[PDB]
């Protein structure tokens, strides 16, 4: 839908009536296009930088640190075009805070019951007790 | 290979022309090395949802209405409809992209341990005497 520039373009800094071509993500902006037909010169972002997404950037993002404070790790590391992917490490689940922050808890087992649901990447084990015990929390 | 962003000429192998953004795609190839790539906007029911070099845009698809799928979002040209579940409906995945919706269940002689959630069924916790099979409470023995 309507937009000043055409899909894909930006309006040039010095030049409001010429739209250039946005960069793609990995790169970022090294020079705008110099006229209406001509190619933005968008270089590839250096190792340890990234740009996620079509930008105009001039420069890269430096590449994130999973959070140690939450027991976070390096499940994927950065690339030009992605950003370090975090979690957690085997047998732990990830809890959400909130939609960007998670803790990494370890999982349950079921003492006096019986895996239900198996631990899943964001999901603690469930539990459905035996005969006897009934369900409490974390634990029966 | 091109540089990060760019994809090799059709006719010259020399060139190598920036990408279309997604919303466009390729209506003319870049004259030369430095010369814009002519990207155009996707008509009105077509997109391309990623960087591209597609010589069309793509038809913006319809929600399943087979699998009680609704759309939670309308197609834009950058972006293909998204499609979801009706409240208290959860998706059940067949593959990757194709899901069917499926009555979130009410624990029957259990209890909702975990509630009904978008990609996950209501999870029950039986009552004495009855244990689970399947995602209900059956009559004790077998």
Same mark, same amino acid.
Not at 58 to 79: A, D, N, P, Y
Not at 124 to 139: I, K, P, W
């Given at each position: 839908?309507?937009?000043?520039?055409?899909?894909?373009?930006?309006?040039?800094?010095?030049?409001?009536?010429?739209?250039?071509?946005?960069?793609?993500?990995?790169?970022?902006?090294?020079?705008?296009?110099?006229?209406?037909?001509?190619?933005?010169?968008?270089?590839?972002?250096?190792?340890?930088?990234?740009?996620?997404?079509?930008?105009?950037?001039?420069?890269?993002?430096? *590449?994130?640190? =999973?959070?140690?404070?939450?027991?976070?790790?390096?499940?994927? #590391? /950065?690339?030009?075009?992605?950003? !370090? &992917? %975090?979690?957690?490490?085997?047998?732990?689940?990830?809890?959400?805070?909130?939609?960007?922050?998670?803790? *990494?808890?370890? =999982?349950?087992?079921?003492?006096?019951?019986?895996?239900?649901? #198996? /631990?899943?990447?964001?999901?603690? !084990? &469930? %539990?459905?007790?035996?005969?006897?015990?009934?369900?409490?929390?974390?634990?029966?």
């Amino acid at each position: 839908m309507d937009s000043v520039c055409p899909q894909g373009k930006y309006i040039h800094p010095q030049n409001n009536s010429i739209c250039c071509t946005k960069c793609h993500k990995g790169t970022y902006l090294y020079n705008d296009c110099p006229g209406p037909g001509q190619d933005t010169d968008c270089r590839e972002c250096e190792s340890g930088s990234f740009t996620a997404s079509e930008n105009h950037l001039r420069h890269c993002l430096s *590449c994130s640190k =999973c959070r140690k404070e939450m027991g976070q790790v390096e499940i994927s #590391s /950065c690339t030009v075009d992605r950003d !370090t &992917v %975090c979690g957690c490490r085997k047998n732990q689940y990830r809890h959400y805070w909130s939609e960007n922050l998670f803790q *990494c808890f370890n =999982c349950s087992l079921c003492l006096n019951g019986t895996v239900h649901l #198996s /631990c899943q990447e964001k999901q603690n !084990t &469930v %539990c459905t007790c035996h005969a006897g015990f009934f369900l409490r929390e974390n634990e029966c």
